[PDB]
Design goal:
The protein is mainly beta. It folds into 2 domains: 1-106, Thrombin, subunit H (Beta Barrel), CATH 2.40.10.120; 107-194, Trypsin-like serine proteases (Thrombin, subunit H), CATH 2.40.10. Helix content is 13%, strand content 41%. It is built from 4 helices and 13 strands. The protein has helices at residues 27-34, 68-71, 144-147, 184-192; strands at residues 5-11, 18-21, 45-49, 54-60, 63-67, 87-89, 94-98, 115-119, 125-130, 135-143, 154-156, 162-172, 175-183. The strands form 2 sheets. A 7-stranded antiparallel β-sheet has the order 2-1-3-4-5-7-6. It has a 6-stranded antiparallel barrel with strand order 8-9-10-13-12-11. The longest helix is centred in the last third of the chain and has 9 residues, at 184-192. It is globular. It starts with a strand and ends with a helix. The structure holds ligand 2R9 and zinc ion. Zn(2+) 3 binds at residues 109, 157. Residues 17-194 form the Peptidase S29 domain. It comes from hepatitis C virus genotype 1a. It is found in: Host cell membrane; Host cytoplasm, Host perinuclear region; Host endoplasmic reticulum membrane; Host lipid droplet.
Length: 194
């Protein structure tokens, strides 16, 4: 198992949502085997990779969360060496490490908002109608190809709180009609329990 490596970040703190790439696909492999990543971290959302796949990770409650079908059991690279996971729920498809220094956590939502926004690896923010605990409809249906590489990113309410973590797409003939996410309350349950 190599280490998960941060190769970029998305910021959600300004008047503008943007991505910024931090590591080429050559420093990634090196960082991955040694698990030592000296690069400074910033942002609420990290763009991360394993050997051939890239996806997202989201900071909430001082934990950097992502999807299990992404990270696996893997450590994540840090300035001090490889970081072992603090939380791992396979049934939930959930992984988390302690948030790296410089990673600002999103606050978990308490609004009850039904209007949501998905953040893509492209710092695109996409309108979503919450239809259940862990589902939301896309106002604009997008092709599946469009959403690939964005799992582990946040679903946000209109006040920019975290409602949950994008996990799977509900897809019909190559089109994404809706999204399934891990509710932010399941993250909190995961945090409280041995
Ligand atoms: C289009 C972009 C979507 C968000 C995306 N995620 C996916 O591809 C997910 C992965 C897999 O689901 C799950 N795996 C493991 C689990 O635990 C170990 C799960 C435990 C509970 C549940 Cl919910 C799902 C789980 C299948 N899947 C689908 O989305 C599938 N959809 C799906 O399963 O939808 C339903 C849930 C509605 C059936 C399908 C392939 C058919 C779209 C992604 O981008 N990943 S990635 O490319 O970044 C690269 C790894 C990081
Ligand atoms: Zn909210």
């Amino acid at each position: 198992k190599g280490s998960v490596v941060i190769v970029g970040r998305i910021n959600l703190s300004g008047d503008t949502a943007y991505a910024q790439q931090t590591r080429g696909e050559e420093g990634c492999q090196e960082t991955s085997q040694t698990g030592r990543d000296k690069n400074q971290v910033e942002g609420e959302v990290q763009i991360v990779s394993t050997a051939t796949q890239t996806f997202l990770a989201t900071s909430i409650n001082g934990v950097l969360w992502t999807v299990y079908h992404g990270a696996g059991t893997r450590t994540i690279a840090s300035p001090k060496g490889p970081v072992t996971q603090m939380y791992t729920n396979v049934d939930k498809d959930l992984v988390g490490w302690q948030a790296p220094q410089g990673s600002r956590s999103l606050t978990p939502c308490t609004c009850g908002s039904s209007d949501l926004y998905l953040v893509t690896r492209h710092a695109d923010v996409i309108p979503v109608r919450r239809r259940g605990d862990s589902r939301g409809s896309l106002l604009s249906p997008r092709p599946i190809s469009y959403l690939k590489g964005s799992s582990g990113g946040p679903l946000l309410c209109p006040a920019g709180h975290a409602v949950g973590i994008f996990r799977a797409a509900v897809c019909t003939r190559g089109v994404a009609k809706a999204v399934d996410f891990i509710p932010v309350e399941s993250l909190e349950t995961t945090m409280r329990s041995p």
